């Protein structure tokens, strides 16, 4: 989190704390019930918001579903939108965290060999993301889908 | 290592969960609890200095710690404690900030008592400064964080012994 | 007259940082500590 | 091809180092066999302890496939 | 043991200073190592 | 390195002066235009790929510099050139958000000219794909930061050539 | 500032800026005019704090104006009511960058060589930088008195 | 390490011998498969990725240890295992074409149990893909190096059990 | 001492003594009986030089001897007395051995941090252990007093 | 041996082995009956060939077996012989091999410094392998002499 | 480095001789003045940082090098500048106890001086407090050691300038 | 490490009493041994070669240690004993000159035994060998330093068995 990298930082020189990384911590609590309410908001959303994303992905791409497509089936579809909900669910995590920092761990370092060994368009989780942030951003105030879409774009950036 | 949102998040991947009202609550306890440790925290990065000057003095110096014999004897020797002071301080003010004693766990504690054997170190010295610390902590710090400063303090303490 | 940035720089000192691993402190600050590795000593100056 | 298994800790009694330094005094680590001779030497150079080692990788018959 | 090498640009050995802030962070490497396909320089340009 | 505040915070101190009313101005201009300048770096760091591809396309490929006897042509010097056109693009972003050109004074235009002047780089090539990246950075930020993001780009292909 | 200590970290790892970054930067362009406001009191109070500082400081230990003091005479306190003055300008700059990225360039770097070269006692500084916080706080708000405070404690924590 | 050639050479240097009939009975033997060990590597080689995959796909993936909770859990975790494995088939490579199992034992088995004992990795797992993929090397090979194939990954599935 | 230092670079370089190293050493054993007699008269006066250079030091600054000085008590005056006797002690160690090295890892280094802890003056112990030094020598032939003063001013340049 | 050489370098870049490596190999593995009867030769021949290079390394140093020779007297000489019978030994453990490093691990690296601590002469010591590559040489076939001729004048390098 | 002794050596080994009746006499010359170098040189070890501190005052400080604008502004500055007066102080001893300014070339001369045009030192002052440092230097060693001690001070100044 | 006098001067350094008489009778007793040290030491470093020459020739030597199947066998191992044996030699004369086996405890038998044990070398015939320099060095010295030679090879016979 936001602690977490201020501290690491703070940590790395051997010194305390100084006031330039404690008003972004003080930012950082004041934000916090608000980042809590966005991640609630989209957790009771979770599965329109899956089911819509899949479906742009499925207008935007149709050739992952065709006969040569990764995601050629009904159990494979349903795979891909378990996938769409990890990545939801990561999404929130780190709109509550404040700071991407789990995601990083979590599916974007070393996601490259799980898409590339399975043999998955990155392109197309990309374009799943993308609707998933657009389904999103239906649902929210613009502070709040503008502060999902930074970290929806961050995921958007790092599959990338 | 972990705060006590990582922590939560962590543990909810675990079991790839959505977060739930019982985390809320303890995020909300957190976001509620982020002044007072933000206040405190700037008073000891005022008065480390000081704080070391009393608690040494409370529980180490004017000893036969102190003298020739001892494993504070030597100017190398009195330094050395004096920067573990130093150094116990300020990674408890980083967990007390952090609000979890993981860091503590991960940049202390780890082989901290297997060198001390080694080298020939008191712990029982070491653990007595530390409770001298926190005793001033408490002091300085107020009736709001004296207790959230005084956990960390204990938690070193116990992990040493 | 002269400015901080005329003395030796303001911008080495900051640049340069520390990094020990940490053993058991996460994938991320392991990764950053070792492409700083790379960074130094075959230098691949983009870092990675 | 032989990597020792080595243990010590190397005490600093010349500095007093105000940053860190734990894992640089206590530490375990392999290290191959030619340069074992001088991480040991310096070792015992700088007042450290040689607690334990170990021959891990290479066989103790050695005089072939050894020297690599 | 265990920290990453850094650029230092020490200042003791008298003359060290300008040669470290020289060799890194003024000068860059030239003479790319592959000798197969030289660059025959003719072409600076991407007009189309 | 620095950005507008400490710029000006400096340029003050070699004075010896208190900062007034005109340095407090400047510093509120640097203020009010914070927002577009975040938004232009996130959706940069988005796009950043996307603005390689096409800059590549529309500026450098496709011609003689990536057929044989080319500097670009091999993998190898194609990768190094995308390289350097990440760089040149992540630095530009850079110098955006801090609102100076120093950073790239220092981290990226320093000896940079005789270096492709050794190695035979393009340094015309160069700077079209430096306007490409500029063109397609102000279609993606949009107006609120295109200007500004185009600045930079505009400094570093002066600076080059 | 702070756009020097969130653009270091991205330098060292050569990536883009992480939306922590950005929103910390927003946390403080948004306190940017509240921030002139305060540093205005401050430098309109110049030489009417210092004087204050002064008194405070030689009541707590007169020594320093003691014959074997480092400030005896005139020209020696003006020269520590100087310095004084030189601490509250660098307080002012720390207040309106948001960091203390120029208190540190400036003024506590290589402090602790020098003040020993000079044999002036720096717990002695110590005290009387915190008499300026003190007549500092007694001039402002609240919350902008507990934000120049912050400055105030990492000066008189980095000059011990 | 050492292949066939050299456990013979030093069988016989410890005695201070010159080779004699037996000895050149075993070289003999090993030569007279040189080629197919050649041709199987090259097969090998050519279908690393492909052997990987079909055995993750038989013995890993769709399981628990794919879901959380796992420890083939999250893309760090998953290219780990998936690293080692490709460590494993290489290795494996490597021991047939030398005709020796030293390799395995100096550079893969050294410690690899504890190491998995400490982060929790699943020996049996791990034992369930090197089998899958000792079943698909078999299959891609033929039969004229499908034992010498599979000698070394019962080998490594020993050693590790 | 000489033996160590010389055998520390010969077992550097991993060699066996050179010509110099070995005269070096010889005229060091030659040099011993005039270095025992000089500690041994030392040792032998101790105390006197122990009290007449706590006097000669307060009498030069009493305001180590003032209310808001570091010496105020009949056992705090005794710390500073027990410290002189010891950095004497450490002066005959030094003159026995033939340099300094047992004295810096005994008393010189992290003796800065030592009194900076302690919030004492640095210089007021230089000048300290230079009154020694008079006292010192005033119990010494000419030449005994030279060699004894030159480990005295060693410990006067470590001080500071 | 090739194999060991090969391996050695595909596990250090990391890779598979190279299609020269696996070239190299094919040609060994074809090699390899002849240079079994080579080997075979030689080791038949191993008395003879020791004896006559022997007595050309007599005729060519009298002083070696002279008073002040390292090889003075019948035990010293008869120690010279086995270490020539070790060095054939050796040599043909290279041959079949097809490489020089059980060669190396068993008896040329630290040859120098062991005819060092023996006195012994190691120009001598090369002088005799040479004398024993013209005996070996005058038992084989003019490719296989070619080929026993690379290990000996490789041996020859190695005493240099 | 050399002092008068290596240097006769090594000019007569050039030569290969042995040494003749003007080696010996430049030997006496040298031998005959080593108790006074000797004992200059234990009172500025003891004298050290007195006699910077008094050069410092007469020459550098209390004017524009140390106010705003002065190389010699800044703490950072003025610890840079009075650690190069200690490196200064050093070698002069060094120099004065060699008998030879051989050591200053090699160890502070070469690089210094297009080193402080780089970074911007006045090299005019540097001189200027240098020879207030030898002042106060001759001042303190007496006639005996006073010119033996100078000497090496104006061979750095007029190596400096 | 440490030698004769600074053994006493630690040990009374650690009881805090200043230098008695029985201290200065037992420096007394290391100085009147001065000259015969040195002596010895010199001898020793002369005839370095010679000595562990005769004492492999003596003990390790003409045995199966140098054959197929010893440790000692090939150019590799008998360079490491006889790297080994010259590194007993240096040391011993390091102890002999200090009158102190403190540099041998820290620099020679700190885990060489279990290091031995690792490698498989005799610890039996390293000890042999050891008692063969013995002899040697007390048969070069003569009676002067034969007791003070012998005492401190004994001292690594003992430690290492
Ligand atoms: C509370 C006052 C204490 C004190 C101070 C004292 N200072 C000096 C002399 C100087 N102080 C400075 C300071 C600075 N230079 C910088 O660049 C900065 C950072 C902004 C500072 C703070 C300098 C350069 C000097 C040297 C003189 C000059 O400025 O020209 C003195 C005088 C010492 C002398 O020998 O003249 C004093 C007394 N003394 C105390 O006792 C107080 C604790
Ligand atoms: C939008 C859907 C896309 C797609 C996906 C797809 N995925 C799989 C299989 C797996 N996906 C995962 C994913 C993860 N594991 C993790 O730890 C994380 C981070 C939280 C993720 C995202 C895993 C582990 C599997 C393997 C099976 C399992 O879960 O146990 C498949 C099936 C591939 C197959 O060969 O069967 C698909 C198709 N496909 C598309 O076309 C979309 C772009
Ligand atoms: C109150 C002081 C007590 C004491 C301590 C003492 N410690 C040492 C030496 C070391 N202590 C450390 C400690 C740490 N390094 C780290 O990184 C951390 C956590 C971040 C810790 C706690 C280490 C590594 C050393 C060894 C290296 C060094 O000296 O810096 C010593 C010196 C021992 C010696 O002389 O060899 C002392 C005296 N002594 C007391 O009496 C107190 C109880
Ligand atoms: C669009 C790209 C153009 C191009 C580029 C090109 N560059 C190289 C090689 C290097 N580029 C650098 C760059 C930098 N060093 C620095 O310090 C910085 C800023 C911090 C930069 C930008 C360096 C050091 C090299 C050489 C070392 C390396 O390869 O990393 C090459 C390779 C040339 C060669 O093979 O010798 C190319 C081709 N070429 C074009 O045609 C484009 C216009
Ligand atoms: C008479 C020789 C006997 C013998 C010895 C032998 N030793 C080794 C290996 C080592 N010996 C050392 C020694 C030292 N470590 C130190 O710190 C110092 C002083 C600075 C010494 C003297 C060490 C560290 C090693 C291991 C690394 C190395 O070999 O250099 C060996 C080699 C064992 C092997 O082949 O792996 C031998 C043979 N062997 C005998 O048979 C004699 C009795
Ligand atoms: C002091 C009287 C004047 C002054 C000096 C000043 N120097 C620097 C920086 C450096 N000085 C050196 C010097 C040496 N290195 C050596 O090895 C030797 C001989 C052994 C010398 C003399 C070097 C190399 C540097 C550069 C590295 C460094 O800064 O330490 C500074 C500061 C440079 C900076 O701030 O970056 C200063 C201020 N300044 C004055 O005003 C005096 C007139
Ligand atoms: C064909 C089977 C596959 C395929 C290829 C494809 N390539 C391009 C464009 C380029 N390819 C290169 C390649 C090289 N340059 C080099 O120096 C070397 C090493 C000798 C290579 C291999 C380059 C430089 C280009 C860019 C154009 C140019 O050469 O100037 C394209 C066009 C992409 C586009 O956006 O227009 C394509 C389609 N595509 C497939 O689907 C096949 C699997
Ligand atoms: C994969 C089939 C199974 C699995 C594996 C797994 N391994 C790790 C971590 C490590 N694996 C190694 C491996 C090796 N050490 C060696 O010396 C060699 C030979 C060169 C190997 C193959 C090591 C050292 C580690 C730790 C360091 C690292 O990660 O590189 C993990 C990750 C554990 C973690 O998250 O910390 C995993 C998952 N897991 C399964 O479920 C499979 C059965
Ligand atoms: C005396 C001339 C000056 C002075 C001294 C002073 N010292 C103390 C307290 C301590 N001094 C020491 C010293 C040493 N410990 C060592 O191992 C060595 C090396 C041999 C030394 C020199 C220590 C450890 C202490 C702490 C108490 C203890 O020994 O256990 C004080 C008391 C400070 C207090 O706060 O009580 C004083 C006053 N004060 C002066 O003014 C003189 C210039
Ligand atoms: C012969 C051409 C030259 C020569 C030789 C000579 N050697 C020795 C003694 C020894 N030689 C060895 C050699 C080896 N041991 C090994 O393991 C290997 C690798 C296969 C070799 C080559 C050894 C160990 C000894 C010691 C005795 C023993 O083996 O037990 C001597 C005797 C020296 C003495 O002092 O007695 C001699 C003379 N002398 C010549 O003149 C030739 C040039």
Redesign the interface.
Known sequence: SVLTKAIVNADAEARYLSPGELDRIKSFVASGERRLRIAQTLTEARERIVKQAGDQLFQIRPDVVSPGGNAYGEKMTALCLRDLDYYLRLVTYGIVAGDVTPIEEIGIIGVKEMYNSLQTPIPAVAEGVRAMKNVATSLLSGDDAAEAGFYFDYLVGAMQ | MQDAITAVINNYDVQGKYLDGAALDKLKAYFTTGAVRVRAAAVISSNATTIIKEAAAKALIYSDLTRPGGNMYTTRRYAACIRDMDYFLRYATYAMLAGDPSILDERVLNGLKETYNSLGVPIAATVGGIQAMKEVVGGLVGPDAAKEASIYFDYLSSGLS | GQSVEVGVGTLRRQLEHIYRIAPDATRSEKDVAINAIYRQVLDVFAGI | ?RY?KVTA?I?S????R???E??????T?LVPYENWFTE??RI??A?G??????????V????????? | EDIVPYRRYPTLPAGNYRASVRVNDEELISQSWSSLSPTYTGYQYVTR
């Open positions: 091809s020792f800790c005490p009694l010349k500095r007093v105000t940053g860190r734990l894992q640089n005094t206590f530490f680590k040991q030497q015992q150079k007042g302890k040689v607690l334990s080692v170990k021959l891990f990788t290479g103790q018959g050695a005089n072939t496939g050894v020297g690599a």
